[PDB]
Every structure is written in structure tokens, then in C-alpha cells.
Symmetry: C3
Subunit: 311 residues, 3 copies
């Protein structure tokens, strides 16, 4: 019984968060999203053309009608790579606190363990020698508390979820599910090329999750990043903000001095892409307790729906 293929709302998000897909091994998430799409697309207002193929590695690209804008959400999560003697290296920049519950699978089967900081080096405490190169991930632990949702990997399974929501009604546009976002990228680059060249699209939205801040508060609305480590074109961000205000959808304006997203890869590509990071903010980013307010999920989905239509 493959019931997950029809999950919805928070149950779908829970599923998405549960799927072990660290950077460099997004394949299982790609597989799920791909079947989910083929199982549900017929219920969408508009049927997209599905691109998944070798020249896209494990990426997925959806093209709805005649697109003008492309949205990018990353399937990869942070995590850790098992090295020698059950030692660990990070995949991306995860939080590393003793006791974090980590899961994975190797040739000897499932793996469960705890993160230990022995001799000032990180390692995986488990009942056996784990195969080298085995990736481990935060143990799924999906919680629904008050107006909140606490789970590992809201970044960016929430983004993936939002994208899929978007797909329910999206008429014109592109939804791209990317790889390696958490760990240096290298998928968006080819996506940047192909989308631009094939569809002549050069506007994007980065569907990812940001931080809750003294300046960006939980439940106060989806965040439009006017900049982070990188800086998009002010006129593009302005234009977005403008459209956002044609709405009663609550949003907050993020101005950070750090952090990067797929947007960076777009910016640095040899293709003249505009980009803007829009997404719900979370507390405890990159921890197994990523927390997001249900209202911001709601705002996020709403702004994406509106932006994708008017951009």
C-alpha cells in the first residue's frame, strides 16, 4: 500500500521531510516527487510537461503552459557523511549537538544512531561499523504544536511542498526541483542554462525557507528577501514587492547580510537571470527542530500563486 502518493497538507509535508535525501543523493526524493506528480497531475488545473532525464541528473523540471517565471526548490537536505570508523563530515551546514538522532541506510541495512562529539571530532554512535560514504540524516520527527510545525528539513521540504501546492493551480510557469543546494550546488547551473535557452525564461523565485529574526517574525508573514549574502536587482525585488502589495497576503521584507540559496547560482550563471528568495521563515534552521508558523506557510503558498500569475 503506497498511500503516501496521495497525501496532502501536513501529512504530505511530513512525508517529504521523512525522505532521506541529503545533498548528492536526492534521488529517492526525486523518485517520490516524480511519482507523486504522475499520480496527481490529473487533478491539477493545468497539466505540466515533465522533464526528468539524464541531462538533468536527478533534477525535475515542470513546465506549465507558456512560462515566464521559474521557481526553484531544493530537494536535498543537510546531513552528514560517514567517513572512517563511523566518523562524520557535514553535508551542508547542519547544527551539530550531542544526542542528535541520525538515520540512514547502508549495505547492511538501516542505520540509527546518535551524534557524539568525542575527542572534539564529530561522529556517529551506533551499534556497528557503517559503510564509508553512508549519508545520515536527522531522524524524522514531525510535530504539530499550536500554530506551529516542528520537524527536521522544513528547509526545504516545505519549499518542495509549496511548489507542489503551486502546481495545483499554476497555469504558466516553471517549477524546478534542484539538487545540492545545501552543499555548493551544481544542478541549478545547468537548469539556469536550459530553462533560459529553451523557454526564454529569465525570472525566478527561489522557494526556500529563511530565518526567523528580530526583523522577520514567526506568523507575521512570508518573507521576501531583498538580499542576503547576495544582492539581486533592486528593480526586480521592487517589482515583486509591488505585486505583493496588490495583495492582502501578509509578507515581511527580509534584509540579511548572509546566507545563500539557489538564487546565487542563478545570479552567477552565464544567463541573465533575475531572482528573488521568497519563503516562510523558520526558527532553529538546520536543526532537527526547524519550526515554522502555519500562517506563513499559508502566506507563502498564496504569494507564490499570485506572483506566478502576475510576474
Amino acid at each position: 500500500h503506497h498511500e503516501n502518493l496521495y497525501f496532502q497538507g501536513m501529512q504530505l509535508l511530513k512525508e517529504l521531510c521523512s525522505i532521506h535525501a541529503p545533498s548528492g543523493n536526492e534521488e529517492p526524493l526525486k523518485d517520490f516527487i516524480l511519482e507523486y506528480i504522475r499520480s496527481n497531475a490529473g487533478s491539477w488545473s493545468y497539466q505540466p510537461v515533465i522533464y526528468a532525464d539524464n541531462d538533468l541528473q536527478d533534477c525535475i523540471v515542470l513546465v506549465f503552459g507558456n512560462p515566464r517565471t521559474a521557481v526553484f526548490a531544493h530537494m536535498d537536505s543537510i546531513g552528514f557523511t560517514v567517513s572512517y570508523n563511523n566518523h562524520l563530515h557535514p553535508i551542508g551546514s547542519p547544527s551539530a549537538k550531542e544526542g542528535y538522532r541520525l538515520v540512514g541506510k547502508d549495505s547492511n541495512g538501516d542505520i540509527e544512531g546518535v551524534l557524539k562529539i568525542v575527542d572534539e571530532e564529530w561522529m556517529l554512535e551506533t551499534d556497528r561499523l557503517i559503510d564509508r560514504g553512508t549519508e545520515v540524516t536527522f531522524k524524522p520527527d514531525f510535530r504539530e504544536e499550536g500554530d506551529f510545525i516542528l520537524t527536521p528539513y522544513l528547509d526545504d521540504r516545505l519549499g518542495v511542498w509549496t511548489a507542489l501546492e503551486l502546481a495545483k493551480t499554476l497555469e504558466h510557469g516553471i517549477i524546478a526541483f534542484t539538487c545540492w543546494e545545501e552543499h555548493g550546488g551544481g544542478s541549478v547551473a545547468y537548469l539556469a542554462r536550459w530553462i533560459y535557452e529553451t523557454f526564454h525564461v529569465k525570472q525566478s523565485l527561489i522557494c526556500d525557507i529563511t530565518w526567523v529574526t528580530e526583523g522577520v517574525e514567526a506568523g507575521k508573514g512570508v518573507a521576501i528577501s531583498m538580499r542576503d549574502r547576495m544582492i539581486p536587482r533592486k528593480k526586480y525585488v521592487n517589482r515583486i514587492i509591488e505585486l505583493a502589495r496588490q495583495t492582502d497576503i501578509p509578507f515581511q521584507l527580509e534584509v540579511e547580510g548572509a546566507g545563500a540559496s539557489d538564487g546565487r547560482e542563478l545570479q552567477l550563471s552565464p544567463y541573465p537571470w533575475d531572482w528573488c528568495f521568497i519563503g516562510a521563515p523558520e526558527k532553529d534552521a538546520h536543526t532537527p527542530n526547524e519550526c515554522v508558523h502555519k500562517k506563513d506557510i499559508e502566506s507563502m503558498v498564496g504569494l507564490y500563486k499570485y506572483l506566478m500569475e502576475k510576474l
Copy 2:
């Protein structure tokens, strides 16, 4: 009016236009109208490229080009975040007192840099709109054999490019964006120029540093390297050519700093590059200072090299 300035007056003007990384448009707009005013008086009329697929970049194509010169329009500055706190745009010098400027929905803006709570702020008359970019207060001084002003880097380069244009016969001049902050304009210019014109030689027209090795007024700097390393054979070719000249120049060898030349190097296109420009004291401060004789050499060397490469 200004659409007709010249010499140091034009420099002053270029230096006054608020164009930090990511918001180069106002400078683009000016440069573009300025070109359209003056091109007719130039020795050769280039084909002007500006538009959607170039974002806010400008590319001038003169004759049958063999070499492309790149000068960045964007300047360092600050981005007002929350409660008038600031983040850098590029890597500007930060010292309590620096005058900054800008405009929001509530009009013009003028502020001092306050380093309250070891965190950088914009002390100003009210709550500034978020994301509002602030720039060093335009203050143009002609002092001895020197020009002191915010943003010689790289408004001197843009200026130099515009001089070049007066007589350039064969070549490309590209005005770039985001150089001070990560780049991402040159990448597409690297592609388009190479693919369209088959040009793969470049000169990075930008400002470098005054050093015990590169002295003010001892001539334009030909960078043999920085953070990055261009092809020796290319650099040598340039130095050979420069030595065919009585134009003074100095050989810079740095272990740090990057430019538009880096973006080219790293592009999927077989670009040769070389950073060439005047040296300045107090880079990235509001007091950027260059020697008039180094400007002169810069212009001269650029003219020559563009004709000979």
C-alpha cells in the same frame, strides 16, 4: 547638460551617481544617454547593446573587435536593514562619521555611519525603508596632482572607457554590474561576447591599490596577478606592447583582490584577461585618491593596447 561634460567634470558627475551593486541602473541610464549624445563626435560609431538580456549592462561594439574592456558601474555601499542597521555592499571601509546618502519612499536620505553596539548603523533623521541602499557622500576634490572622491573605483574606469571610446576603432567596451559584490553580470557578457563576436581577449579597466610596489603617479598598473592568475603569455604580450611605449606603467604583483577578470577566468569561455588601471590610496573609503598622471597613463595605455592586441 551633464550629458556633455568632459574631463574631470565628467568624472565628478560619474562619481555622484548613486549606483551600488545590484542597482546600477541610474548610472547605466546616464552612461547610455551620454553615449547617445557623444558617439557622433567619436572617431567611430559603435553599435550599442543594452536591454533585457543584458540586464543593466551596456556593451559597445566598435568595428571588428578583438579585445573587450570591462569596467564596473557598481559601487560599494551599504544596505539598510532593520532599525537603520546596515550591511555592507561590497567591502567598504567603515569608520564612525562617514557620510552616506540615498532615497526612499519618504524622500532623500543623508546619514552618518554609527558603530553603536559594535554593530553598524545608519544614524539619520528617521526610520529608513528596508533595503534602501546608501552610498558614500559624493565629495569631489582636485588637490595638487590628485583627484579625491568617493568611487574612483570604478567610476574612473568607466570614465577611462568613455575616453577610449573617443578614438577606439576596433573593440568592445562593456559596462558591468555587481563587480563589488559577487558579480554575475560578466558571466553572461563573457558568453555573449565570445559566442557572438568570437572575442576572447580582455582588459579589466578598474582601479587598484597604491603600494610600496605600485606608487602613486609612477604610472598605470598592469596587474600580473592578484587573487587570481592570468595567463603568463598574455600578460607578457601586454607588457611587451606597453614597452613599445613611452607611457609610464608599473607591474603589479598581488596575492589578493579580484575583479571582473575573475569572472571571465572562471567562465565557460576561453578568455584571456588582464587587469590594467591606475592605483589609488585609501581604496574603498570615501577618499579614494588617484594621481592625475596615472589617469593619463591609463587612458594612453588603453588606447594603445586596444589598437595593438
Copy 3:
């Protein structure tokens, strides 16, 4: 005579050729003369690609390729700046006494590394021309099961590549530049190879570190990751293949270090990559040391993978 060398003598010669990042030309020149003398003795004759549009890179195409191997010609070293001071080319080891060689307009250069005033420089005869590159003094040694020489990294890769060519039927072998220093050649190789031959699989033929996890003489290393992370399914495929073999290999898992693989990964083309090379002791020192049995595993595994991938 060198144009015919073999075995370790070919490696000695490769290691002796002064070719730091940004100036790989001499090695290119040697590799090309060499390929043109010996390709005839090979099982299959490749198509040679070296041009203006490849800068100083070389690309060999055997038959109908599915996979591309990349080996970097450039070596670490140092660039002489002002007053015989120095900057690093790549990340070389810095120890007083290190023997350095070069050549400027005043002939040959031989010197040592001096740490004067917390600052690095070259102690030599005379003032060295600015921007002159210097290199570890060749010192090829054969000692037990080991080879000790500067620049095993990546002359051993270059060497391995040349061996592979002796038998390779279908595949691409590319000799790269600037790998030790920010790269910028692979970017265009990635485009060109992918677009022209529809090849999107690679093996990075470079040398890694001897480690508590990767031991000398215990076989060639298949890197599951380093600073970067390749596609797990690709790496798995490689390991699977290696296991069909009696060739010894070790599974490397590092949290740092980059290769030409990174450039491929980050390119606008869907490259799979995997770093496979012998491990070395004392990397980036004049005493790089590798075990012959690992060189033999390396050659062996490349030959096999190129045939099976």
C-alpha cells in the same frame, strides 16, 4: 630523447618541467610533442585538440567516448612580487630552505625560501623580475616501493593519463590548467566536451592524501567525496565496477579538498564526476611521496573503468 621516455623516466621528466598555474605552456608543449611521437604505438590513435580556443589545454578523443578523464598540468609554486618577495601559486607548503627554481629576463634562477620578517621571500643572486614564477627544484627519487618528488601532484596524473592512452579505445583525456589555483580551464572543457561529444561522465585523475583511512600501498583511492559531493549513484557505480576487479582500492571520504571535479560539478553542464587517484604523503611539498603499487592500481583501475563506464 625525452620525447620517448617511459616508465619512471617519463615521470621524472614530467615533474621536472616548470609549469605553475597560469603558465602550463611548457608542459603542454612537451605533452604535445610526446603524444605526436608515440600515439602511433598506441592501440588507438586519438584526435588531438589544442588551439587558441582551448588556451593551453589539451584534449584527446579516442574513438567514440563516453567518459572523460581530467588531469591537471599546473603545479603549485610561487610568484615573485616586489623585492624578491613572494606570493603563493596554489597552496604550497612553506618551509625555510625550500629549493626554488625559475627563469626571468636575466636567465635562470635558483634560490631558497626565507621567512624574513614574518614575511615570505626568495633568497637568490639578484633582484628577480616581477611576476616571475618559481617552482620546487626537481628532485626525483626512487626509494624502496616509493617515489619521492615534487609535483607528483599532478604530474603522476598526467603520467597516468599518458599510460591510459597507450590502450584506451573510447574516451576523452583532457589536460587542464590552473587546477591548483582557482581553475578556469575546465569550465570551457566542460562545455565543449559535453556539447561536442555528449560526454557527461568524468574521472578526475589527480592525487589525494595518505590518511589514517587511506594508506600508502593499500591501493588507489576512489573519493566518495571531499569538499564537494558527487552523485552517490555515480560513485556507487564506480565502486561496483572496481569490485569486479582484483585491483586494490581504498574508499576515500574527506570533508575537504577540491579538484577539477568541482569545476565540472559547478559548470552549466550535467557532469557526473569522481576523483580517483593514488594517495600521497607530504602533499604540496618538495617531498611528495607515493607507493609504486598505488600507481599500478591507479593505472589498472583507470584502464578498466574507461572501458566499462
